[PDB]
Design a protein around this ligand. Sequence first.
Ligand SMILES: O=C(Nc1nncn1C1CC1)[C@@H]1CCOc2ccc(Cl)cc21
Ligand SMILES: O=C(Nc1nncn1C1CC1)[C@@H]1CCOc2ccc(Cl)cc21
Lengths: 304, 304
Amino acid sequence: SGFRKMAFPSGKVEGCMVQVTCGTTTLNGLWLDDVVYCPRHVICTSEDMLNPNYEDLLIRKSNHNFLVQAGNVQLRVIGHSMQNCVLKLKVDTANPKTPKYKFVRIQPGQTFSVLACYNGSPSGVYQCAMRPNFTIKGSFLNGSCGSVGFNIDYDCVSFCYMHHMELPTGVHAGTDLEGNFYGPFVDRQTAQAAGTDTTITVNVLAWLYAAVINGDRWFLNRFTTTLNDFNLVAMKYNYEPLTQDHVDILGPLSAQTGIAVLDMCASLKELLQNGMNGRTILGSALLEDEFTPFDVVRQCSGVT
Amino acid sequence: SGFRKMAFPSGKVEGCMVQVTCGTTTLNGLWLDDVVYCPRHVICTSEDMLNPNYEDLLIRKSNHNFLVQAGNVQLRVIGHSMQNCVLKLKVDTANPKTPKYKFVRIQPGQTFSVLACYNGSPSGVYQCAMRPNFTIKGSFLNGSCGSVGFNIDYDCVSFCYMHHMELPTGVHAGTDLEGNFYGPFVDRQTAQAAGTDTTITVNVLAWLYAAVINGDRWFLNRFTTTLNDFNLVAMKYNYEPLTQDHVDILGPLSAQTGIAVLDMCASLKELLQNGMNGRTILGSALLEDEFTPFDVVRQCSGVT
Ligand SMILES: O=C(Nc1nncn1C1CC1)[C@@H]1CCOc2ccc(Cl)cc21
Ligand SMILES: O=C(Nc1nncn1C1CC1)[C@@H]1CCOc2ccc(Cl)cc21
């Protein structure tokens, strides 16, 4: 028993991290097969960032300007191209440590592990969720750009995020591995509105099920609710509206604990209306929304 | 910016994980050089666990009874010995993926990453602290025994914990890599008292400094306190008494933010006496004690 904010083991990703330097800018790249992926802003100086013309800036660069280093060994760049906000540096050597991998665009509300890196070196790993507003609340300092988010299914690493920037509000923004930003963000030093964020209701319900499985049941009550009534409360408390698709995804956890989804919804409604009253659920004094129903099942059945 | 409960990258540890089977029991082992380390209770059946005579149980085992598997390849056991609560299985092959490593006995209140494993396969990684009462609050299911806790300093992995058991209270207990239990625990299925636990005061102060560095300052106030006065409040709220050694370890964070340690102590005293009042600090609605002052400095300066 026990339930923790668990990251995927990062080994397969560590073997893909490289350092990319262009001019005076150094950040991280992801080396898969014979391509290194990195944020295109590696080609900007600090002054270029107000409003960079990336197509023009990239035209002044040649393959020999992109210094790619994997640990201590230097990679030979034989091509470069910009795809949305990422650069693809073709190298003459396929990464011998390339795992089975896929590039995926995750949905808001889904979770992933981030391997935070500096100068191509892994610093740490943490699990987070993509907020409904397409930002992530990470831990990223200058030089962390190019760090990636991923999930693993057996031996296949699905890369879903590459880190690009910190908005003036301290929240984080990045792209899929085809360089498409999640959300409305652009890779320029300008104030940018992140939309209204909401709490990921299906994740909070999943975590309440994780709580019951792991011994915490104080919040269970004698009530039930309906999707309509629960969504009125979800509206008031800035929670994502619950749908039958969300209810279906909670099916396995509802079957495992014997607590109907709408009965768990009534517990959540009471917690929203009354708070925790100085109590905790799985070491938390707030309603946790960074575990999907899949994460709860995977953690509770010990999937390797 | 941003502050997360970050684990060390687990790659170097993943390469050391093996599956050890003895009879009908399977758990994890740590393969370093030509030795595999695992909990001695791999030699018990479920019935042996009430009160096992480990010396007698081990006498009925030969090297050929310990099945050690690294991924798909089988290791040849050429020796076995019990050291406290761990077995050391000498194998004929040194692990080619053995990193630079040390075995260390951590102090209560220190933190470490756990790589949770099942059948020799890594499932996830999370950071936790050794409680003042020598238990850990992990996420461990049947078969997770043998999973290890560690810290990394550049390229050296200091292994500090090997998981042995879950107490009837749902908390976790384990040993150092020489098989000495942390705390009063014994590897037998019997009810065992974990001592009175306390909150790790120096860690909460470190995390309050991490909060200030990362933009959260609502809790800062116009007051100060003394070690004596703060310790009266620490006593009442079951916090570890603060010493000048703790104050010295917070020196770097006090110098970085310009907030004297006793002034941060007055903020903590007000938070203890009045609560958060429905507010949060770094995404938490309670006072976090799983970040040491070293973790805060390391996270805030991007150490790889
Ligand atoms: O955000 C950036 N780096 C970053 N990403 N996570 C953390 N950090 C550092 C600032 C704390 C760079 C520097 C600031 O100016 C910009 C502007 C646009 C872009 Cl794409 C990147 C950047
Ligand atoms: O605790 C144990 N395994 C374990 N450790 N973390 C999680 N879990 C499973 C139970 C949930 C085993 C089985 C229970 O009985 C015992 C008794 C003594 C010893 Cl050393 C190990 C064990």
